[PDB]
């Protein structure tokens, strides 16, 4: 089975947050629990009744044929929790297995046919993922900031102006909030078109229909790869500056052994009448006091914080004298991509890269040395070697459209030149509903 | 009436080409070209002059202005005091400033109420245009034609570029156009007439 | 492909003169490309040939 293929399943909290209220609002019976005594025909009856391919989990060991039915019709099982999930299924294959799941986002549009009750997409989830865990006080701050950008007076908002208790502050957080009638008991009643007004059935994140329309475009812009230019991680490595392209990441050579960085690895140790910052190498446990003579290591550094200066310096020394490759995944940076004539207006010490604050954005520059003309045949030889340490871990130049608009040999293309993408130029056409479209490819 | 929209002409996009040239390169062979063709193809052939080392597609800084609190100078939106630690000053160059930035992009696009009105427009007489452009042009165009690489066809000295672009445009899957084009909304009234450009 | 004529912008050039004995240490190493000549005064090609 392919990675898309398998048995879809989501945690209850996810189900409750999203699919359930939509089920209530669309007037369908609550989807059935699956005891494992459950017949596949029962599940089909339920998926008929709910107009959604969902079932809630109930109790241990789902029977085989019902499970095969869950797989064939892409029914979304809703697990109370993910612990020991495989025990819940009777896999005759014994092929179902923990850590064989593929976690992924799933748009609500994919499971609901009722288009009116769906506004956003995978995009907003993907953007919430970039966001820090948010205190309610931080949320209020964010809101008030957005307000001041838009010039509104948000004073006393989310507050109580009591005469005797003074001003008080309630939380402004209300993800997926709905207007619902409550019982005098204070508990919520399920929305009833019979008495509650129709405008109330589904608050659309409290936005105008137009703002939702634009919101879709914007979510498409924000999740677009070209705009995403806050790069993560740097690979430190000691090579001659050969490759012209900015997006270069040197390959790790065949003999290297990956080693997760940990404070445990480096230790002060006596060696030849002094206290070398010895590094013991985990495959063999051999201790190497000198930066030189250490085995080729591809040391990943997940967390720069708490690294000793003697140790940061020792790692970089090992990068040079023993040719270590040192990925440093904790760095977030923006990259300007300088042309050869503008050189390197900014310069960075290894010490700064090994000791930047964990949240601050570094600003690296990278040469695109492609537009650099051949040396005169009589220029004096360069005895010494140009050398380079810092590299991107993933591609930069995601924003690039064109490159090297100059001829090579007056006809032949330069290696590394890039023509603009074809999609820049398809002044397509409107769809019958006024959406933009690319021109049809082939026919019809 | 409520001013529900901001009527404007020759609209800003959310994205703009931005280019770096190594200025020592310059083709010896100057390209005298038609006057009317240079007022269409022109802003492009200047934006992608010989020696452009790189052409990027950035957020339009002129649109996502400092008025929205965004700074696009470092290549990502960066908004100053949205997501912040409380009880301490946030510090400079925070990475959260990027996430805040996307919100202010997402916000600013959510509320772009611009409504295009047709701006000043030329109707070149056609014999006055080289055929590659005349095939692209559709009757009329705004004088601020703006930039598009498809315009570089049969104009840029840089041969591989012209060969590859002509190679793209001659495929069925892509077909560039400019200015007035027929649309389902043509002739529709709303005080004035709707048109498609 | 043409041989360059205008004076090009070369990377900065460290000249770590190397003696009989020395204490190499690599804190404050430059990370951007940086040429590393060993001898002082390499401009030895002085006899120009018209």
């Amino acid at each position: 089975d392919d990675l898309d293929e398998g048995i879809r399943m989501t945690t209850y909290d996810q189900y409750l947050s999203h699919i359930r209220e939509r089920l209530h609002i669309t007037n369908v019976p609550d989807p059935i629990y699956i005891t494992g005594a459950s017949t596949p025909d029962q599940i089909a009856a339920s998926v008929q009744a709910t107009h959604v391919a969902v079932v809630l989990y109930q109790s241990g060991v789902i029977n085989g044929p019902a499970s095969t039915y869950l797989r064939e019709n892409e029914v979304l099982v809703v697990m109370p929790d993910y612990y020991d999930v495989v025990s819940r299924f009777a896999n005759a294959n014994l092929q179902m297995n923990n850590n064989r799941y593929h976690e992924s986002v799933l748009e609500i549009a994919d499971i609901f046919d009722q288009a009116d009750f769906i506004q956003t997409s995978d995009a907003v989830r993907q953007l919430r993922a970039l966001m820090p865990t948010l205190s309610t006080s931080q949320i209020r701050h964010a809101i008030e900031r957005i307000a001041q950008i838009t010039d509104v007076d948000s004073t006393d908002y989310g507050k109580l102006t009591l005469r005797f208790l003074g001003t008080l502050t309630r939380s402004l957080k209300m993800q997926n909030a709905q207007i619902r009638r409550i019982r005098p008991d204070g508990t919520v009643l399920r929305y009833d078109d019979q008495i509650d007004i129709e405008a109330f059935r589904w608050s659309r994140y409290f936005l105008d229909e137009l703002q939702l329309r634009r919101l879709s475009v914007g979510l498409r812009l924000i999740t677009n790869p070209r705009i995403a230019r806050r790069f993560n991680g740097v690979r430190i490595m000691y090579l001659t500056d050969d490759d012209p392209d900015p997006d270069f990441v040197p390959d790790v050579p065949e003999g290297y052994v990956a080693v997760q960085y940990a404070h445990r690895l480096f230790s002060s140790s006596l060696a030849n009448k002094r206290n070398r910052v010895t590094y013991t190498h985990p495959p063999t446990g051999m201790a190497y006091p000198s930066p030189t003579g250490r085995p080729h290591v591809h040391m990943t550094i997940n967390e720069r914080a708490g690294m000793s200066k003697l140790v940061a310096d020792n790692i970089i020394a090992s990068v040079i004298k023993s040719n270590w490759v040192v990925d440093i995944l904790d760095i977030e940076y923006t990259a300007e991509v300088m042309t050869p004539s503008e050189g390197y207006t900014q310069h960075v010490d290894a010490e700064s890269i090994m000791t930047a604050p964990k949240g601050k954005l570094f600003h690296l520059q990278f040469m695109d040395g492609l537009l650099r003309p051949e040396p005169s045949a009589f220029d004096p030889p360069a005895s010494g070697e140009d050398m380079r340490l810092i590299y991107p871990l993933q591609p930069i130049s995601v924003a690039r459209s064109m490159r090297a608009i100059v001829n090579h040999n007056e006809v032949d293309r330069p290696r590394g030149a890039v023509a603009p993408s074809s999609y820049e130029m398809d002044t397509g056409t409107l769809s019958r509903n006024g959406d933009l479209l690319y021109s049809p490819v082939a026919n019809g | 009436l409520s001013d529900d929209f901001k009527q404007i002409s020759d609209p800003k996009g959310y994205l703009t080409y931005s280019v770096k040239y190594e200025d020592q390169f310059t083709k010896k062979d100057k390209l005298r070209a038609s006057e009317a063709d240079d007022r269409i193809v022109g802003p492009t052939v200047n934006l992608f002059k010989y020696g452009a080392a790189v052409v990027n597609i950035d957020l339009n800084r002129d649109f996502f202005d400092t008025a929205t609190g965004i700074d696009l100078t470092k290549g990502i939106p960066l908004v100053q005091d949205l997501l912040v630690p409380i009880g301490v000053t946030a510090g400079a160059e925070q990475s959260a400033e990027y996430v805040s930035g996307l919100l202010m992009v997402l916000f600013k696009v959510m509320t772009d109420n611009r409504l295009v009105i047709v701006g000043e427009t030329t109707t070149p007489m056609s014999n006055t245009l080289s055929t590659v452009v005349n095939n692209v042009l559709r009757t009329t165009y705004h004088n601020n034609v703006g930039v598009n690489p498809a315009l570089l066809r049969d104009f840029t000295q840089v041969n591989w570029l012209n060969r590859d672009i002509t190679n793209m445009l001659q495929q069925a899957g892509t077909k560039y156009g400019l200015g007035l084009t027929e649309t389902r909304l043509d002739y529709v009234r709303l005080v004035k007439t709707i048109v498609g450009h | 492909d043409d041989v360059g004529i205008m004076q090009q912008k070369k990377p900065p050039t460290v000249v770590q003169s190397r003696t009989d004995v020395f204490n190499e240490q690599f804190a404050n190493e430059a990370l951007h490309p940086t040429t590393k000549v060993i001898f002082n005064g390499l401009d030895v090609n002085t006899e120009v040939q018209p």
Partner: peptide, 26 residues
């Protein structure tokens, strides 16, 4: 003379819509 880099980005020219008093059609 020394080699030199330069940069350019397409300018905004968006303007509030003109208030013409003349009309195109009858």
């Amino acid at each position: 003379k020394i080699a030199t880099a330069s940069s350019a980005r397409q300018a905004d020219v968006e303007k509030p819509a003109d208030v013409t008093f003349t009309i195109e059609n009858v």
